[PDB]
From Swiss-Prot:
It comes from Streptomyces exfoliatus (Streptomyces hydrogenans). InterPro entries: Isoprenoid_synthase_dom_sf (IPR008949), PentlnSyn (IPR054969), Terpene_cyclase-like_2 (IPR034686). Keywords: Antibiotic biosynthesis, Disulfide bond, Lyase, Magnesium, Metal-binding. Disulfide bonds join 126-134. Mg(2+) 3 binds at residues 210, 214, 218. Changing residue 75 to Y: 20-fold decrease in activity and catalytic efficiency. One of its GO terms (molecular function) is metal ion binding. The lineage of its organism: Bacteria, Bacillati, Actinomycetota, Actinomycetes, Kitasatosporales. Its cofactor is Mg(2+). A motif (DDXXD motif) lies at residues 78-82. One of its GO terms (biological process) is antibiotic biosynthetic process. PANTHER family: BETA-PINACENE SYNTHASE-RELATED (PTHR35201:SF4), TERPENE SYNTHASE (PTHR35201). Coiled coil: none annotated. This is Pentalenene synthase. The gene is penA. It catalyses: (2E,6E)-farnesyl diphosphate = pentalenene + diphosphate.
C-alpha cells in the first residue's frame, strides 16, 4: 500500500462498477469455486471487481461482468499453488493441463471446478471476435500456464523477471480489454517492435508495483523470490535502497513508455493503416494498454 509513483495517465473507472461489485458472487458460486460463506467474504475483501472496473473502464453490463469474473478466476486459480502442489513441476502441470485443455475443445464433467470456470470465461472471451484474434489469445494463455510450470521447477533479477512476466497475467488481461471494448488492434501492428515494447513495459511495471505493495506479507513467511529480496542479494543492498531503485525503474519505464507512444503515428504509416485501423490502434493505446498500467496503481491505493 501507499508508496509514491510517477504515473502520468488519466485515472478512470467504470460508471457501472458498484452494481458489478454487488453481483460479484453469483458466478464463482454457481461453478463451485466458492462453497462456504466465509470463503465468499474472504473473496469480497480481495477487491477484484474494483480492479476489473479500472482495467476495463470502458466496459458495461455483461462485458464488465466478464472482466470481474476473469479477475476472480485469476486469484482463485493462484491459491491452488500456495500449497505443496506449487513445488512439484508434475502436480502443477497435472492441473495446468486440465485447465489449458479447454482451449482445444469441451471438458469432461470430471474436470475440477477451476477448469470449468476457466472454460466458461474463455467461451465468452472468444464468441464474436475473429478466429485469428481468438488464436492469438489462446497462444497467450498457454504461455501463462507454462509460466506456472517453469516456476514450480525452481524448487538474479534478470532471471526473476524472466519467469515472472508470464505468471503475472497481464497479457491475457489486456487481451480482455479488446473483447470488452468489442474492438481489435490491427494484428500486424500488434506484432510490431514498438507495441510489444509498450506491452513489455505494462508487464514490468505491474510486477514491480505488485512486488512493492505486498512486501511485508511475503517477507514474514521467508520468501526470497521477491524483487526486493532478490535486489539485496544480487547487489548487496539495504532493504531501503532496493525499494527506491524500484521506484526509479518504474519512473524510467514510464518515461520511455511515453517516448514510444509518440512513435506511434509514424508506426501507423509504416503499416499503412487505414482510417478504421488507425482508430482501433488508438483505442488499444488508451483503453487497453493504458488502463492496465494505471488501473493497477489506482487500485493498490485503497483495495487489495
Amino acid at each position: 500500500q501507499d508508496v509514491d509513483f510517477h504515473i502520468p495517465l488519466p485515472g478512470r473507472q467504470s460508471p457501472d462498477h458498484a452494481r458489478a461489485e454487488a453481483e460479484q458472487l453469483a458466478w464463482p458460486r454457481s461453478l463451485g469455486l466458492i462453497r462456504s460463506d466465509a470463503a465468499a467474504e474472504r473473496h469480497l475483501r480481495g477487491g477484484y471487481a474494483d480492479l476489473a472496473s479500472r482495467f476495463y473502464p470502458h466496459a458495461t453490463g455483461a462485458d464488465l461482468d466478464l472482466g470481474v469474473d476473469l479477475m476472480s478466476w485469476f486469484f482463485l486459480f493462484d491459491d491452488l499453488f500456495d500449497g505443496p502442489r506449487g513445488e512439484n513441476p508434475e502436480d502443477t502441470k497435472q492441473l495446468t493441463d486440465q485447465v489449458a485443455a479447454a482451449l482445444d475443445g469441451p471438458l469432461p464433467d470430471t474436470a475440477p471446478p477451476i477448469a470449468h470456470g476457466f472454460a466458461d470465461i474463455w467461451r465468452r472471451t472468444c464468441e464474436g471476435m475473429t478466429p485469428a484474434w481468438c488464436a492469438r489469445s489462446a497462444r497467450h494463455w498457454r504461455n501463462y500456464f507454462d509460466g506456472y510450470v517453469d516456476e514450480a521447477e525452481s524448487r538474479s533479477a534478470a532471471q526473476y523477471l524472466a519467469m515472472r512476466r508470464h505468471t503475472i497475467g497481464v497479457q491475457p488481461t489486456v487481451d480482455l480489454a479488446e473483447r470488452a471494448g468489442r474492438f481489435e488492434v490491427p494484428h500486424r501492428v500488434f506484432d510490431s517492435a514498438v507495441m510489444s515494447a509498450m506491452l513489455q513495459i505494462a508487464v514490468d511495471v505491474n510486477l514491480l508495483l505488485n512486488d512493492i505493495a505486498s512486501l511485508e506479507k511475503e517477507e514474514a513467511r521467508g520468501e526470497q523470490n521477491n524483487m526486493v529480496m532478490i535486489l539485496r542479494r544480487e547487489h548487496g543492498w539495504s532493504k531501503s535502497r532496493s525499494v527506491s531503485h524500484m521506484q526509479n525503474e518504474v519512473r524510467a519505464r514510464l518515461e520511455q513508455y511515453l517516448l514510444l507512444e509518440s512513435c506511434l503515428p509514424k508506426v501507423g504509416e509504416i503499416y499503412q493503416l487505414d482510417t478504421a485501423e488507425r482508430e482501433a490502434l488508438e483505442r488499444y493505446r488508451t483503453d487497453a494498454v493504458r488502463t492496465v498500467i494505471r488501473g493497477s496503481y489506482d487500485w493498490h491505493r485503497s483495495s487489495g
